[PDB]
Design a protein around this ligand. Structure first.
Ligand SMILES: CC(C)(COP(=O)(O)OP(=O)(O)OC[C@H]1O[C@@H](n2cnc3c(N)ncnc32)[C@H](O)[C@@H]1OP(=O)(O)O)[C@@H](O)C(=O)NCCC(=O)NCCS
Ligand SMILES: CC(C)(COP(=O)(O)OP(=O)(O)OC[C@H]1O[C@@H](n2cnc3c(N)ncnc32)[C@H](O)[C@@H]1OP(=O)(O)O)[C@@H](O)C(=O)NCCC(=O)NCCS
Ligand SMILES: O=C1C[C@@H](c2ccc(O)cc2)Oc2cc(O)cc(O)c21
Ligand SMILES: O=C1C[C@@H](c2ccc(O)cc2)Oc2cc(O)cc(O)c21
Lengths: 389, 389
């Protein structure tokens, strides 16, 4: 009553992305990384890393950190050196800055003045501060001083689902609300030299990249003025069984540490079916249309690593093209933690318009966005596409 | 549609609180603190601290840290020693544990089984981890594995407003949703020895205490089954003008640092009037009932320090009893960052039932909850009380 609510489903009205300009191709990374960390003498460890990169299904990544910066800051090149203050000094500044680039692109596409942003959600796994990255981004953009802000820190790879789950309620419960949603990630918080005693940290050095994505989310788009690309219809969150300690990350004096068990793909792939069947049963209940088949949904899946995608595709019997947009982003950007699924959403709508398909979801009506991260946490969003032309 | 929404205003259905058992009386704190930090020879600095404690309007605080723990961990007793890993090891465990005590009390009052909790918001300024304090609390309580979680880290003293602003939308936009809201704060993240070059850190040693509060928030309470205590009707957030750097806190290798300018009370007190007049004009628009006067509202004000309360009371012309519940909590608990306003909400409803007043807000119908923190951020919540008997 005192605050009127909206009527239609929360919708994605624009998407922007941004990446550091420095690109490192995966074929060059093993020599680049063991050279800059003064580890080339550890030949066996390096050959293990070569095999990880060869199997990563990542062709290239964008990285804030460059050879110059690393040689200037030797504490980032060792494996276990006090370096948190240095890392924070970097990402407390650069994470909002990259988010600002992505947010400016999203606002430009949206087409409305930036003062119509009423809410801001900023999600990151890269650094913490008070005031936070949300405050910094609001300052960089010049948002209204009364924007309702929320900073989601230390989220990890499920955060792209989390921000949609929250943005849905902000948009739908507040008439006129327009929510800027930013995920921004920079691996300077976690980059460190190699050690043959922590081989799971090696995996992160093969897969993690930098990037930021931004959405405008709102209900009741103004006809002929704003344009919906996807609709948020259902959300769910689950802690998978027997996953205690599957994915851990601690903010230590040596920076952000990464711990990752070899059974993560098995835990995800063996439990995701029941989760999706339950979610789809809630969205398409019997009392009535049956749920679409997996092959008739579009898929925006966090590519935690190729083994996760391969095992999910195998266990669910997905046709080999269902994860093509997901794998394209992994190939060209690596795993960008919470930002990754929004890059995939952008890739999917852009391919759909390019190829003149009938909807923003590759021609399918309904779709799924999945985030996976520490918990082991599974975030599920059931999405509807929008018809094209 | 696919997720039905609720109808009535988000309501506080129960409140629980918890504090560490160790109490330190303010009259003992100056000798306790300069002794345990081996600083008694700094007589002038100590006399400055005595005056801060004498003027703090804090009679006692609950503190996780004890003389025993501090003597066992000398790095916490110095002013600038690497200690973040040690501090985190403490609060990553103890903050959820204290939150669990407060949440269990709230659930017991609520009276419904814990599995009816559908959402969880965990807010803290004390430590960060992945998975987070939200995950840890869900595990400690045995919440449903599908609870929709949100962890708000590095929030600071406005966080009690923030959690209500978010909980309002989760409760109202989700039919049947019952939101567990926990704020939990433990000063081990920030405690350090004194230095006469950082006199604002001294202020924190005079004012900051430990505590956790928990709410059940939901719309459409079941008649004769659940009981509403306050209703959330309007929310606003503001960055106050010319407040860049007024309140900063950085998570460093020496733990959480605190920076606080002497003009914080002036910034708050000189701007709060326009903010409240605007908020009340939105809730009571003309086109119609005029807004109640300040003296006919109930007041739940974050007691950042006595100077803030005194200057707000002076600038707004508040009668001397309006801030009595606020000052009682400051007197008996200190400044517990984000948890403090929920302790005050509990104190107010408990006094109201005890004294047989006509509403949960001291006999007034409408009220204001105000959080202040880094930004300088002002969180405003317009509340309605509930009639008593
Ligand atoms: C890493 C990966 C891309 C390549 O591995 P793969 O295609 O299965 O190929 P292999 O089985 O040859 O693995 C190569 C090496 O990686 C090692 N490895 C893989 N996962 C590892 C882990 N979590 N910890 C330590 N070593 C690991 C293997 O032990 C092997 O070492 P070896 O050649 O010396 O025996 C793949 O395992 C993967 O994608 N895993 C999932 C990644 C993940 O969990 N990310 C989630 C994000 S938080
Ligand atoms: C600290 C306080 C409780 C007591 O101060 P007071 O009642 O004004 O009394 P005084 O003016 O004598 O202040 C006592 C001493 O505190 C010092 N002091 C107060 N605020 C200070 C600050 N932010 N930084 C450094 N010193 C400070 C004064 O300089 C004075 O030192 P002195 O006796 O050597 O001159 C009061 O100033 C206050 O409540 N301030 C607001 C606290 C605050 O901003 N908290 C927000 C939470 S993040
Ligand atoms: O170790 C960190 C690094 C991180 C990250 C990735 C990319 C980037 O650009 C910045 C940070 O994401 C994570 C995600 C997790 O679920 C667990 C983790 O431990 C981590
Ligand atoms: O320096 C920290 C300490 C902290 C805190 C208080 C009490 C407690 O029990 C735990 C932590 O709250 C803060 C609140 C702020 O707005 C800014 C800050 O820098 C801090």
């Amino acid at each position: 009553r005192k605050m009127e609510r909206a009527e239609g489903p929360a919708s994605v009205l624009a998407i922007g992305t941004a990446v550091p300009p420095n690109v490192v191709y995966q074929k060059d990374y093993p020599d680049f990384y063991f050279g800059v960390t003064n580890s080339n003498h550890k030949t066996e460890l390096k050959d293990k890393f070569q095999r990880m990169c060869d199997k990563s299904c990542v062709s290239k990544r964008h990285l804030y950190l460059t050879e110059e910066i690393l040689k200037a800051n030797p504490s980032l090149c060792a494996y276990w050196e006090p370096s948190l203050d240095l890392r924070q000094d970097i990402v407390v500044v650069e994470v909002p800055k990259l988010g600002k680039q992505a947010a400016s692109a999203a606002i430009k596409e949206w087409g409305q003045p930036k003062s119509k942003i009423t809410h801001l959600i900023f999600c990151t796994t890269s650094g913490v501060d008070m005031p936070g990255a949300d405050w910094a981004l609001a300052k960089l953009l010049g948002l209204r001083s009364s924007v309702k802000r929320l900073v989601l820190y230390m989220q990890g790879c499920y955060g792209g689902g989390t921000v949609l789950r929250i943005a849905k309620d902000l948009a739908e419960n507040n008439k006129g609300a327009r929510v800027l949603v930013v995920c921004s990630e920079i691996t300077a918080i976690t980059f460190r030299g190699p050690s043959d005693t922590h081989l799971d940290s090696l995996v992160g050095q093969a897969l993690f990249g930098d990037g930021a994505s931004a959405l405008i989310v709102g209900s009741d788009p103004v006809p002929a003025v704003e344009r919906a690309w996807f609709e948020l219809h259902w959300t769910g969150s689950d802690i998978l069984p027997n996953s205690d300690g599957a994915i851990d990350g601690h903010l230590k004096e040596v920076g952000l540490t990464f711990h990752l068990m070899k059974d993560v793909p098995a835990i995800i792939s063996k439990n995701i079916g029941g989760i999706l069947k339950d979610a789809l049963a809630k969205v398409f209940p019997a009392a009535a249309p049956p749920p679409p088949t997996y092959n008739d949904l579009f898929w925006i899946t966090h590519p935690g690593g190729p083994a996760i995608l391969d095992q999910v595709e195998d266990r669910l019997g997905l046709r080999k093209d269902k994860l093509a947009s997901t794998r394209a982003v992994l190939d060209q950007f690596g795993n960008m933690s919470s930002a990754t699924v929004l890059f995939i959403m952008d890739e999917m709508r852009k391919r759909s318009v390019e190829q003149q398909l009938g909807t923003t979801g590759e021609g399918h009506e309904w779709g799924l966005l999945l985030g996976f991260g520490p918990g082991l946490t599974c975030e599920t969003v059931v999405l509807r596409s929008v018809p094209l032309v």
